[PDB]
Design a protein around this ligand. Structure first.
Ligand SMILES: CN(C)NC(=O)CCC(=O)O
Ligand SMILES: CN(C)NC(=O)CCC(=O)O
Ligand SMILES: [Zn+2]
Ligand SMILES: [Zn+2]
Lengths: 339, 339
């Protein structure tokens, strides 16, 4: 199923989106349940760290009116982080980690600019028929226009705050504002925080994979710049290197204006902006997860095992004095002994 | 080379031992240097944690006179740990670790007895032509006959103590008394302590492999009862499972009455009692190695890397709550990511 049968906009405006807009992949997916926030099922899902789309939080209600003209006019003047890509797949690398891998070259460069500048480039490419794609990802801080700040004050903080309280998560780390061109893709990867993905303008197709599918997704070495990202190219999966990618099953859904997707921590997610569907705008909120209990309980959850693996890689890297030696030692350790 | 050309006993008593007495193996070996304790080269070797045979310490001079009759008469009455084997290869397992692996069966059982009892069994088998082989391994404590205690007091403690002092090792953990039948084999493995192997009666062929040959020797999982032992059968090496066993190079030597073999910590050693060479007697002394420095220094030594691997296996086993899950997690961790 996945996104399944497209929702119909009220007033007979027709199907919000349709199939030809989604990209094609090798794996099967099932739908993430779209529920009402009042629905006890949703709170259960969140409590159990399973994804769910909430259709009625009103979380970013004030922002549903945002668009580029509005944002330009009222977002004020400040530098916005903007990324560029040669193709539809945006490549993110952690700059602090580049020292560890010399044979790494940036394929998706960051550029700091002013909203009007980013808007100019966007409009320009549209007219100039450029190959290029752009993505604006900027954390929001109190430097924004008065109107935007008022809009922010209008968010349903009461609801997001209650969620944080009930589940015992840590304080709200931050929120990021995301504006991207249609067809843009943020390749599968996972975060270690609990995320609330609130859609504002346009539709984004969100594909999630649970933590227990770690074997099928082949993340980069922890010391690699692309740590937490899948090495597998969903457009041309290499089965010889990533054999278990053939056993992967995603959870799929398409979020639109007013929807909030709870992405549990450690859950893989692949996100794409619908083809020919125009510009997209999202505001993502995230919380550090609740801290681990004193005496752990078995069976362990899959994400704890993932945490365990991450930790061994980090320590091994620190102990040897080089991250490059991690793989060789681990192989020496496994070969003919555990495999 | 290895043992090379057999030493000649004084008074033209002829060759102490000869080739037909050594077992046949697939790998090449070179000789461990036999030096005088006065030789500065020996102290250098020991300082550098490289094996060496000292021909003149007089370490167990008083014991050179030991034999079974003498030991029976004077060793007093106490229980001695004695192991039995179906074949020439003695199998040692760590009993505390058996809970972790159910599909493990003892193939070399321990039996507590009295010296005269062990001597009886030995003599009996000799007459009865038994298939069986026996090995007496007992730590020595002040329960021994007065004569034996006097003999002990006669050891060149001054020399062994000076060795311990100069090198910064910890206190002498203990010493073990080893009496075995000719042809007996203690399969390759390593200890984490610094050992001084002092030969008393008979000849033992000692084959050592440095720590850096860990990949070629394939030790059992740390949680396995046979932890620290090579999984490879030197009599029938399985190259499909242990491919790098074909790259293994040992250091060889045959120790006789009066010789002391320094076996550095973490160094693999394979020890056999010469065929048809009669009974063997050895006293092994060991020290915990010097403690690790505050700020480590790179490059790391091979034994530190081995220590690192051991530690990761232990921790992983404790973290998961089962030692059986170690291998699966490590594979998940390596596959398509580091290999
Ligand atoms: C932080 N994470 C949940 N958020 C994302 O990955 C957003 C990616 C995007 O929407 O393109
Ligand atoms: C403790 N280790 C050095 N000693 C041994 O392995 C003795 C084995 C034996 O000589 O059979
Ligand atoms: Zn993410
Ligand atoms: Zn040993």
């Amino acid at each position: 199923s996945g996104s399944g049968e497209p929702r119909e906009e009220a007033g007979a405006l027709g199907p919000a989106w349709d199939e030809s807009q989604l990209r094609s992949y090798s794996f099967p997916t099932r739908p993430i349940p779209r529920l009402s926030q009042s629905d006890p099922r949703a709170e259960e899902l969140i409590e159990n760290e399973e994804p769910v789309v909430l259709t009625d939080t009103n979380l970013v209600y004030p922002a549903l009116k945002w668009d580029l003209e509005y944002l330009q006019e009222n977002i004020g003047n400040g530098d916005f982080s903007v990324y560029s890509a040669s193709t539809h797949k945006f490549l993110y690398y952690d700059e602090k980690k580049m020292a560890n891998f010399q044979n790494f070259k940036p394929r998706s460069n960051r550029e700091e600019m002013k909203f009007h500048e980013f808007v100019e480039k966007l409009q320009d490419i549209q007219q100039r028929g450029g190959e290029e794609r752009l993505y604006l990802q900027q954390t929001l801080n109190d430097t924004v226009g008065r109107k935007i700040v008022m809009d922010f004050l209008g968010f349903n903080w009461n609801w997001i705050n209650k969620q944080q309280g009930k589940r015992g998560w840590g304080q709200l780390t931050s929120n990021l504002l995301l504006i991207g061109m249609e067809g843009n893709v943020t390749p599968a990867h996972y975060d270690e925080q609990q995320n609330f993905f609130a859609q504002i303008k346009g539709y984004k197709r969100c594909i999630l994979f649970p933590p227990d599918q770690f074997e099928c997704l082949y993340p980069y070495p922890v010391h690699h710049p692309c740590d937490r990202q899948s090495q597998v190219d969903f457009d041309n999966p290499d089965y010889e290197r990533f054999p278990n990618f053939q056993n992967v099953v995603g959870y799929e859904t398409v979020v639109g204006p007013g929807d909030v997707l709870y992405i549990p921590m450690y859950w893989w997610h692949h996100i794409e902006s619908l083809l020919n569907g125009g510009i997209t705008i999202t505001v993502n909120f995230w919380y550090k997860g609740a801290p681990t209990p004193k005496r752990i309980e078995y069976p362990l959850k899959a994400h704890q095992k993932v945490a365990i693996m991450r930790n061994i890689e980090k320590m091994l890297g620190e102990a040897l004095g080089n991250p490059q030696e991690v793989g060789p030692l681990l192989n020496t350790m496994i070969k003919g002994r555990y495999n």
